[PDB]
Design a protein around this ligand. Structure first.
Ligand SMILES: [Zn+2]
Length: 168
């Protein structure tokens, strides 16, 4: 199933996710809906909390044709280094993009779909995308990194979009 993605100014976007107690089949269904929803929305990453599920699950797939899906359940950041950024977008902040400072390299520990632990050293777009999605899990949005004015702007704009989203 495709899940409804929350947009700003929804307050549920600011909730902190609880860790997954057990990676069982209810979790694995959350994973497939999350993947489906992400592909339907044309994202490369998506966190549980954007779909109103407040648990530490992220899916990502940067690959051309879905042969490289990535699942991180209860991720933890082990190390980071460097700094970069690109003009990010967010499914919950429709049609807005902004350069955001990120660490350039990142080392994480997470569980996969099967509840197995793995470690991942990422750089490039992958590193940026993981940092973005991990922020979602503690209630952070990329616009939180920008000035009051920039945010104030990003907020007017999206409300206008969705104004017309319910289109009627
Ligand atoms: Zn996002």
């Amino acid at each position: 199933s495709v899940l409804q993605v929350l947009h700003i100014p929804d307050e549920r976007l600011r909730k902190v996710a609880k860790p997954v107690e057990e990676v069982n089949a209810e979790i694995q269904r959350i994973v497939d809906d999350m993947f489906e929803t992400m592909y339907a929305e044309e994202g490369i990453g998506l966190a549980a909390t954007q779909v109103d599920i407040h648990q530490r699950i992220i899916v990502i797939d940067v690959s051309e044709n879905r042969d490289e899906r990535l699942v991180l359940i209860n991720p933890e950041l082990l190390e980071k280094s460097g700094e970069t950024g690109i003009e990010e977008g967010c499914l919950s902040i429709p049609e807005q993009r902004a350069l955001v400072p990120r660490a350039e390299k990142v080392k994480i520990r997470a569980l996969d779909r099967d509840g197995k632990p793995f470690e991942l050293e990422a750089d490039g777009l992958l590193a940026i995308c993981i940092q973005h999605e991990m922020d979602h899990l503690v209630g952070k949005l990329f616009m939180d990194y920008l000035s009051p004015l920039k945010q104030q702007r990003i907020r007017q704009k999206v409300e206008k979009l969705d104004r017309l989203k319910a289109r009627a």
